[PDB]
Point group: C3
Chain length 112, copies 3
């Protein structure tokens, strides 16, 4: 299994959530984060500001999934979250060593 961390623009969330619902995905956790850098009209991180803020609110999605379906998920996320403009974000895939369902105390083969 692999973990996917996609930090997308907050308004794509539904289109993405729905698209993954179609590809057989169940279970998703969304974190609201502060995005820094890579924004329209700007070409500077930090910037100082004083009265202005330097962040663009973002949405981080997290999902662990089998290796086989990894490419469907990334291919689908890129499809539903991409605008072709600055600020689209990235997808990072990490390797999970173990995954246990709390309700049963039962583990999943982290190698599938």
């Amino acid at each position: 299994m692999k973990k996917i961390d996609a930090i997308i623009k907050p308004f794509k969330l539904d289109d993405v959530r729905e698209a993954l619902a179609e590809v057989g995905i169940t279970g998703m956790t969304v974190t609201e984060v502060k995005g820094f850098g890579r924004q329209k009209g700007h070409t500077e991180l930090y910037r100082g500001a004083e009265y202005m803020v330097d962040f663009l609110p973002k949405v981080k999605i997290e999902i662990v999934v089998p290796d086989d379906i990894v490419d469907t998920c990334v291919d689908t996320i890129i499809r539903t979250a991409q605008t072709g403009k600055i600020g689209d974000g990235k997808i990072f895939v990490f390797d999970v060593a173990r995954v246990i369902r709390i309700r049963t105390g039962e583990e999943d083969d982290a190698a599938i």
Copy 2:
């Protein structure tokens, strides 16, 4: 060392926080997230809704710990956070490559 990411039901947090306090754990960070899918009365993710929301607020706990004690922590979390009902969540263990204490600039053996 290994990292444990448990997304539990928000009301189990204390029972878990306390139980890990007993097993020698120090240091924990809690993130409040939006949980999607696997909920009572529902059998659909996304769902559309319109006026209804589709998420159940969750609590994500994060802790890095030695390999030896990994199983005590998961065994303890399952014990304190499990309700035997739908929505209990999962525990994911990841491998940490490096861990540095900011205060000293001192590193820990990430292989213990």
Copy 3:
């Protein structure tokens, strides 16, 4: 590439954000978390409390970066976020398997 997760004291954020801006870093996501344990005047996690809270609000920064520059980032973070007091936090570096830019559907060599 490697992922850096630094949970610092919330007031160091700017000094850190700026320092990384100088070292060539672009892109950062900040999550506001609840920090548990390791606090001045306290020597107990959980504590029970009743009317008191047991957490200290923290700031989690996340950045994926090339392997070569990993040590500049950790060395810089320790420099800008360290107070030499209790509660400074840690930096954890994880290995990223894949990183895709959503806007182009283009991947980066996760091995650099």
